[PDB]
Amino acid sequence: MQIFVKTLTGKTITLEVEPSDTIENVKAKIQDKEGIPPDQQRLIFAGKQLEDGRTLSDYNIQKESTLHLVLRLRGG
Amino acid sequence: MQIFVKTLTGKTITLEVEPSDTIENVKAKIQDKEGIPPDQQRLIFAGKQLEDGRTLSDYNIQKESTLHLVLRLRGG
Numbered sequence A, B: 001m002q003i004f005v006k007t008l009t010g011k012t013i014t015l016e017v018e019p020s021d022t023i024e025n026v027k028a029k030i031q032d033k034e035g036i037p038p039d040q041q042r043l044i045f046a047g048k049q050l051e052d053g054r055t056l057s058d059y060n061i062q063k064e065s066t067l068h069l070v071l072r073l074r075g076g
């Protein structure tokens, strides 16, 4: 299924995922498409900062959902 | 000046800081007192995930302010 990722500059990424993908898998796919290290990615959805070991289905991320991606150089 | 840090278990940390301290300095002080690596710390205040290179004064963190600390193993 297709999901989207929006960035702070207004850009949209499209990803091919499954509900059983983990957030780790999703960040890895963003690295595959756009070269961003997973450790620099914060994915945010429905008011929650997403955890790498949980799945898309855990967060009710569905076909056509849009995640918010914020990049970071250090933790915070 | 004195600020406080609240955790998800309900515990309170007390820190001695200055408005010109960076968030990096604050996380380093939490490591000094409690041994938590800065890379595992997320400090959250007034609806903002705080950035390591900004100062307490940038976020209007004041005497008696309480930050929210959420620990993470991987970026998320």
Ligand SMILES: [Mg+2]
Residues within 6 Å of the ligand: B028, B029, B031, B032
């Ligand atoms: Mg130290």
